[PDB]
Amino acid sequence: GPKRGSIVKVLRRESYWFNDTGKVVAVDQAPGVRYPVVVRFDKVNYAGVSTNNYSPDELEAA
Amino acid sequence: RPLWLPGTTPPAHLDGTLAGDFGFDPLGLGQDPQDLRWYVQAELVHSRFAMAGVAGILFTDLLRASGRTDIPVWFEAGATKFDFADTTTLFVVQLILMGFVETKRWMDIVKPGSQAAEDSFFGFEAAFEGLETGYPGGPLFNPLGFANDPTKPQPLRWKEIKNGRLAMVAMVGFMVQAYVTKTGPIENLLTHLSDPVHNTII
Amino acid sequence: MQDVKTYLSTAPVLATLWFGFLAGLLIEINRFFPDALVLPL
């Protein structure tokens, strides 16, 4: 998917970080992974976590 | 160059070559390009109008103190004086007149082509200024051709606003004094020179 | 001394200092300009 350390903006409609930016950590390049991109945000959600994984077609704005 | 405070720390949005520059922008008022290219013109027109107001306020009270005419005081001239026409009519006429000039100045500020005249005067009726900012020219504005050269009008262009700022603070002083002393400004100055250490702010 | 300044830079201390200064200001104004209902300007 996208490059490491790239700043991407989310499009997942049911995400706490929708329309927010975050820097990729490490996208897994396995053959059958459905949500390989891993992005960490600088603001926790209602549960307190700041890292989440998306699919490459689910978030991109650069 | 000298600045307003010797512990300079000069700002970046204004560096040099501007007429009357002393690096005085502590409140970061004009930091954007539009802000500076607009505030220069604002200060210009303000300085000029305040200089005209000073020249219309001093002379009158001065000659009236020295006994030359019987004109009323500055804070009394426009104040309820039936002189030639209804005051409101004159206000409306002044607005309608100043519209056709402030619109031209605005046009030249935003898109700097307005020199050509109108009403079949497309020919030998061009205003020959071509300056960097709102400095007009031509016999209608600069008849004697005094603004001769660029890169050395800085003395005169400096003198203009260095007098206009003084005129502005002088006008504010006139207003506040004639509001709190209920008296003429040169009368205030004379009563001050009577005994300075007793005629101060209340 | 640096940590003392940091502690004085806390939220409750700055809050109480600000509100106390404001209370003093308003109290002095009302002791000198009392019963102000209409602005005389």
Binding site: - | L27 | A11, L37, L39, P40
Partner: protein, 159 residues
């Protein structure tokens, strides 16, 4: 005049609202000696009452059928000292507070630990911004004209 209220310096019901209070204060006063702290305090209170009642009549407020001032918050030029004149200075102060707070937030947000700079204020920067916040209208309108006032990529989501 307006709204069927008479001016207060002619209201025959204000005289009673003054003299009754005065007489109550004097009844309180007659329980001490004229050279004791209670008597001095009560005389000060009476002088304050007189100074208060001799200011409303001179200002121009309109009293009611019960002898009490009534504020005409209408825009009436003869009554600008009741709502719009103090309202303008209040709006000035409140815009000052809001603008300097917004600017402090904007400046802090671009730092290392922005959440740390909100429980532990940095007094130099805050003071700088409070100082510069005197000409806030000339700055708010300038930020509006320059398109720097609002965002467009807000993070609201609803599935």
């Amino acid at each position: 005049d307006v709204a069927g209220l008479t001016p207060c310096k002619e209201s025959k019901g204000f005289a009673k609202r003054e003299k009754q209070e005065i007489k109550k204060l004097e009844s309180r006063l007659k329980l001490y000696a004229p050279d004791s702290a209670p008597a001095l305090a009560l005389n000060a209170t009476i002088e304050k009452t007189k100074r208060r009642f001799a200011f409303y009549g001179n200002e121009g407020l309109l009293c009611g059928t019960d002898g009490l001032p009534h504020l005409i918050v209408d825009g009436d030029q003869a009554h600008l000292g009741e709502f719009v004149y103090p309202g303008l200075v209040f709006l000035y102060i409140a815009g000052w507070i809001g603008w300097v707070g917004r600017a402090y937030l904007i400046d802090v947000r671009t730092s290392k630990k922005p959440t740390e700079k909100e429980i532990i204020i940095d007094v130099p920067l805050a003071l700088r911004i409070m100082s510069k916040g005197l000409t806030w209208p000339v700055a708010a309108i300038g930020e509006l004209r320059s398109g720097k006032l609002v965002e467009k990529s807000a993070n609201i989501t609803v599935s």
